[PDB]
Amino acid sequence: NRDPASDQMKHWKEQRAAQKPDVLTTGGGNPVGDKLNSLTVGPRGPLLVQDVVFTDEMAHFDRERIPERVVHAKGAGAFGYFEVTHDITRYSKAKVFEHIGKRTPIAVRFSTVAGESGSADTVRDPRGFAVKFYTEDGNWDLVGNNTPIFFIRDALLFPSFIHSQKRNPQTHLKDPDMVWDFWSLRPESLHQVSFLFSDRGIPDGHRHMDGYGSHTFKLVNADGEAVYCKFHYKTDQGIKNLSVEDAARLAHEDPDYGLRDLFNAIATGNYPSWTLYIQVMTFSEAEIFPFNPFDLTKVWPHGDYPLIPVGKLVLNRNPVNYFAEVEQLAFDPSNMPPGIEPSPDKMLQGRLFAYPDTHRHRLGPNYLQIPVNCPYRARVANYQRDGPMCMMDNQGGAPNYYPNSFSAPEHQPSALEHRTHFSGDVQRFNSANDDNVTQVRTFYLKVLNEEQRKRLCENIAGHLKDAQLFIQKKAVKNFSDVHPEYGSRIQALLDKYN
Amino acid sequence: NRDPASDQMKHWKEQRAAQKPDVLTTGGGNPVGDKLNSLTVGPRGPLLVQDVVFTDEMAHFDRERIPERVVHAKGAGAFGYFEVTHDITRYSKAKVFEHIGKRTPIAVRFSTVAGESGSADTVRDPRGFAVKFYTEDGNWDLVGNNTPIFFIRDALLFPSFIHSQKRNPQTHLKDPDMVWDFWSLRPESLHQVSFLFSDRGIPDGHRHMDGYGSHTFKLVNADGEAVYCKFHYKTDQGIKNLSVEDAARLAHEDPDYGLRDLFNAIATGNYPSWTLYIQVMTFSEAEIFPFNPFDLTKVWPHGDYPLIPVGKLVLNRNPVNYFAEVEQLAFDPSNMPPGIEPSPDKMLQGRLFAYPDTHRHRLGPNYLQIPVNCPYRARVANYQRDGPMCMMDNQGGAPNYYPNSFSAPEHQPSALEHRTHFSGDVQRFNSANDDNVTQVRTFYLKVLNEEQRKRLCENIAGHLKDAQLFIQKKAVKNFSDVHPEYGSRIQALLDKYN
Amino acid sequence: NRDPASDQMKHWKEQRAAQKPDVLTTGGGNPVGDKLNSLTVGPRGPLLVQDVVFTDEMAHFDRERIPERVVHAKGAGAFGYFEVTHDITRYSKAKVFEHIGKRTPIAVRFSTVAGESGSADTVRDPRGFAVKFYTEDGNWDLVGNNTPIFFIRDALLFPSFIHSQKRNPQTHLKDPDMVWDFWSLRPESLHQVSFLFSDRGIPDGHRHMDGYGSHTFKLVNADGEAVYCKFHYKTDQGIKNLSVEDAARLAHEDPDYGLRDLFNAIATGNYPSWTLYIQVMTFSEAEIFPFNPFDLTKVWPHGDYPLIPVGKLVLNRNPVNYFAEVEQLAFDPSNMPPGIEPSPDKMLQGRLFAYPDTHRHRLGPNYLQIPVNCPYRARVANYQRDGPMCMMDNQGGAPNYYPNSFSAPEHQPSALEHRTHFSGDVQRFNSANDDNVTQVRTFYLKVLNEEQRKRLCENIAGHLKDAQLFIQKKAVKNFSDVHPEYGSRIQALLDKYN
Amino acid sequence: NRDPASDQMKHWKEQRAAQKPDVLTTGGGNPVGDKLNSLTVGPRGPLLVQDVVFTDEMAHFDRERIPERVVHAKGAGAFGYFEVTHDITRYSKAKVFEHIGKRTPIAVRFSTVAGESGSADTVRDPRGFAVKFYTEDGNWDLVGNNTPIFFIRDALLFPSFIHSQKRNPQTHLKDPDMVWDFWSLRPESLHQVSFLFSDRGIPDGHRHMDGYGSHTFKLVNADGEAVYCKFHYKTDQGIKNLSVEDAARLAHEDPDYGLRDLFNAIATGNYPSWTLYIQVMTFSEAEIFPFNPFDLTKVWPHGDYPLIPVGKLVLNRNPVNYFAEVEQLAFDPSNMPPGIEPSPDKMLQGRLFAYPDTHRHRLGPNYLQIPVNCPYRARVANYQRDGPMCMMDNQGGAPNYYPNSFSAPEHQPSALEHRTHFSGDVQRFNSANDDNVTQVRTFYLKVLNEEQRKRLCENIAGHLKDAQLFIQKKAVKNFSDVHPEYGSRIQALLDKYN
């Protein structure tokens, strides 16, 4: 026959032998007699306002759409589980990790970054890979990308970054001057620019790309003891990338390529997994790391910070409803359960704010009650009330102020954050000048071959070629800074294009 | 001790000996260590952005308020049951009335009409008495008033109506120029104004007033035979109104008088009931009733159209949470299940549209998924999908187009509406010169005594007095028009004020 | 250099020599000192909550996206003028057509129909061609399509229609089972499907397609004499469609092809025009036209109803800001100023309600105050007040009730609608067995050549092939029903695919 | 005649001799023929969906209401100006203050705190007194109360505070156990509890109460030099309070008493003013102040910190439209122009967040474009775009990322915040135990007479009397702590009530 993606209504149906379709209602639950024909006066007369069946149905239609995500708008989702396989309770007291063999339920959204909802899957762009964990200590979202780094070290530049990757305010086209003005103007961006215009540019679907946490977390054990960390969840299926030729065909042949695959995998029983490691850096090594340990354009070398196994991530269940389980899934960085905790990373620090800020806009004040966003494996008791589209019992008749004499929830000191020490001037510290090439240099010299560097160049100018020549000049100079061959390999190409 | 409203937290607690308070969490379900102290650098330093407990709880606060009801904003609610006590099966094939002794669950909100949410209960104003029934044919909402009539016969004059009962666009004050300007310029308004300024303008609480459907519905039996009707739900508690001096006192002394009283009755075992009655009008009697049978400023005389008993309405359960079961209740008149159906009543035809329309504004697109507004005694199966705050499973992976070869829901013929014939010009018919006094005149000579007649006169004039003399002059003509003594009993008094 | 879309920022700048950049502010207008570095304690400390510049700008970001159009989501817009060139005053008393040479301002958005916002321009889909006119009798919106007909005759089947053109509720993929399931089960759908899979299914850009009002309007002259009509706005640029091979290429190569092209034409002085024409049908010819004159799956033959010229539509100004003048444009069909008026067209009667309904959802309650949607060539005076984002002075302190003794606005009789007589049963008339093939048959024998006939066949089958065989079987019967060779030219090909 | 509040439509009218009311339109700007009569078929037929005049009007009605403020919901507003009268440029470099005789425009909202929109003006409760300044350096809102202190020192307790002052979640009544549980449980609250149950409990309208900034600001001069400050704006009309007897009559006689007065003042030309002083505390005095200088329950003694004149606040213009100019006014603490700047005050620090957070909910993402909320006297240029109900030109075609090579706005280093030094552990520092009585003690002994203390007691128990006796016990103990007579004067009363 055909791929399971395609046999969907077929199976929905096959599955009800215990048929006799339900009665077609209105949302008030009144049964409908005719839904193919509006109520008029005379077969050729006008539409009656008493066709409250028309308006019901129509009123709902006209309301189906919610704003799509500010970035990362286009994606795939799926459910499965995390299971412990080694223990790191030395490092962390978090339940999710509390005992080898332990299994917590998880949801996952894969996506691109710049493209809007009708875009094509198979495009050069970073790639979200977000995991929500319904632990007992509440949800723990770990909002990762498929890259360990990023383009910038200060959240304040984010809007601008994102703006320049999207569309001209006047034109509504993608604009290379904007792409290339930004980037060449902020060279802290060359590390990930270098990752992206590489073969890892475009993965072969979600199942053949790694996931990272990117940021530096803080892990705290049962004694109050702290260490910094890095999360890496590697593909059990391997890497596998799509040539740029392959990628263009699929953009038109199957703009939704990655939903299809993800779907079909799981469905045919071919469950993707990933192995979660952690890098660990003590506070003192932190004090000596030749770079700012909390700098998104930076990786921790694994000769120095070898990886430590933690458990697996198994993807084994397809959404029944895309809208309700994928369009509406809300991942908040700030959903850190006792034992995990953010570091001083500038980028992390504004994600603390931004996520729940746009969820309250896109989904609504109470988006945490949407089925899939509910810490269901835990017990929410607090003094927050009311708000639009308030679903549950609103916590009934329970005292709503704190503190009170009437047995309402009470805080639990064991969940205090880790005491830590800060001394400084409240000022705005430059970061544009931290080291912008070193790590880039090596990447280019020792992590990637010769074809790979011949390609990474071709792809770079192949896009760059359409900025104005100044932007070109600036850009290559920067590239030139990281390694002189990086630069004149690119300048030569640019020449022949130009 | 005290009355039960007052002992609430005291009972909420007495009720948990299996205490040991729950753990206080964020909305993500993550446990909190200190909810009395924000997170800072040093005890006199600034507030960290990292205090994602502060922003969780505050973020929820700053978002607790939804718009109040455009009208009837202030109210009380409660749950109970409707119980069939006579059969009207000849008249209607509706499930709710299917067999003597049947009980259907019902919710009810009482409310006043023009005050905004912190106003006083005990003001002269009409009173809302809505009844939502959860039937097997979905919900059936009977958005009645405690008056059998109203001020107007065209929904088109409603906005205006209410605009003038509210406050001034410039001042935010209540204005008698606006009240009396409108009412005097539209004397169809005499019928209900006479009802409004008599003893029943101020019910002693909610329990001592009648509920009226006011509009003329149409009943359809199992043979396709329709008849016109009017619903009356009379109080088993008796009429009882508070003197205007009594009301002044309590408006200041206890703004919530009515809420307190309903809570307390039911809390102590004194459950209000109302007997539901129907007047019936054949299609024949209707081609001959001397007035528009469908005119909301008219009643059907009880010697002509005797009241027939239908069942009883008992209230026997208070809300746990007011916000979630009384503020979020949405009654839509268009929620009529098979055997109940709207008449050509111009005021009713406008209500068909407005209730859901504002419900999608106030509450949200999918406000019918609010536990309390859910037709939970029926099963919802349709082609409506998606939309903000989509709570259900959103009907899974079931075909969302109609018709379809795949066993998704089907319309049911036994639910077609009742066939009626209309002939005429598509035009806008005046209804301003429909008879404005007859019924009024009678009302004032034979319905109200002499005490009352002096009383309705003082009350009226006591408010009329503050308009501009032009306005009185015209207010009084109108009055003079229903009965010369009505007119001049009032002038008598207005001269003495003026 | 390059095409003008591409030189935008370059020109935005060349355009300010009176430079010296403005001071960068918050939204409160407070000047910013560093917008590249957030505020922290020490250079590696945490982010202060005090960085109210971070939260200002990020808070705005996280809130940039409004819902996209439920349909016709992807588009292009532009401004220009409509110019009377013949008089039709006999037919219509509308101000817009009042006198030869009159120019009224107009806006226009082109769009496709089923793709979401990042889709490709050049797909086979119908094409939207909306025209908003700013007349002295307020706005008049002509929400046309580039097709004179459509797929259905009852708005009630619309949700379904579109649900099946979109993607699967479970998969998020496009499904041929859904496409062909519906279309085969509703053959009224043959008329437009035949139009859709022929050469004109893919216009070469926006400039080379015709605009059609599709529905039958009704024109009312200054004597009260009405007539039925249809609007045709033909391209002065000529027809021109891209081969399906050409389209594949560009869907990948330039998703925005159409936007780019419209921008560029107008940018370079090549201003598109379309000639507007009206077919007229007396009320008489309508009691005898052999079909429902008001049936959207039918055209009025041009030998019977010749096209009469009305004026010209020129586009001659591009947007400054796309979000604000193209994404926020709201066209409502019900915006018809005196002398234009809806017919009993069941599809049109449903559109009367849906456009404003979704506009209040997407944009907001008061979306008609959006500069671009404002009837700026008229003066708005009514009793509507308040509501979210109320921008105007909200009509000051002017009486907000009607009627009133205080000189607030008054209704104007010369604007009453046109009197028509309707007689019949309030019922729901089938329209499914209205004639589904005649016009179709002709269309395929005499309207389309032999090349085209082979072509519309391959195209059709090329997509049909992916449905379940049942579905083809039935798809093909239908086809067989309009012409035996239509039916079997297709089977011929489907057998060879299958 | 009557008070100007009352002659409002009268004057609106009087004012158009240049009458002939405007034409009554629809919002699209189409003229209306009949607005008193819906469109039906037959004078007694049903409502046509083509009455797009009905739905327009009605659609808007149903949308008029926006959520009211979370607190401070009920109030009055007015416009006028601030003028400099002494100079403090030693202290501050802020333009508003830049030169004696200087005048900046201002808006003001007076309000209560707990009561919802229909509440009564004349009630014991603190009183908002908020001033918005349209300076050249953007707006400067100074969100003050009519008290120099507050009930709490940590924002985290705010929701809970507010909750307990409102209504029981179950009951919806005001609950003294909740009021008195909170307060007695958190004694840091006795300073302001002492202010509130005093004669300053209920002012005689807005014009006879002082305004304070309450919080501690930071003032920075042109050299980078800093000092801490306190803003006091004293009534030029004097104090004047309403006995509690007076206050109850007015609650029913004229729930809107304070709007009326405020209105009438200004209208009759009786412009209220207030004199703005500043207290100043150097950083070293800060280091030695026997208390936490940044503690809301604390005042700076004026023998020690005598007041320094700054300018006047003159109120001389009434709103033309309440909704648009008072309901929609948004005051943000965070609207601090270069020269003014927040201190480490815990309460201030969460107001930085909360205000704009709930404005984006209640009014909308773009509430800064609402006429009255617009920094109109300044020039907004930034990189923020889009968002719902986006009014202006959206900044046209101007580069939207930063930094860029194309002359888009640039930041201005002279607006850097003041460098300052913080050293600490990131922890949550208790504050419940800071001194809770001292200042209270003196208040009670030396700021208020003997009648005043006899009253302050009577009012206290007069309310307290309705909590349970435990709450009573706790409470008086606390009162007892501040001074033993405070306590047994209250216990005696409580006795006689109980």
Ligand code: HEM
């Ligand atoms: C953590 C401490 C506080 C928090 C979080 C807080 C929060 C809020 C909120 C959410 C509103 C509603 C605003 C709107 O919808 O536009 C509000 C209004 C207001 N607050 Fe507070 N409040 C705090 C303490 C105080 C204090 C100490 C004062 C006086 C110094 C004050 C003065 C006001 C005033 C006057 C308003 C009314 C705004 C208006 O009149 O438009 N707050 N506050």
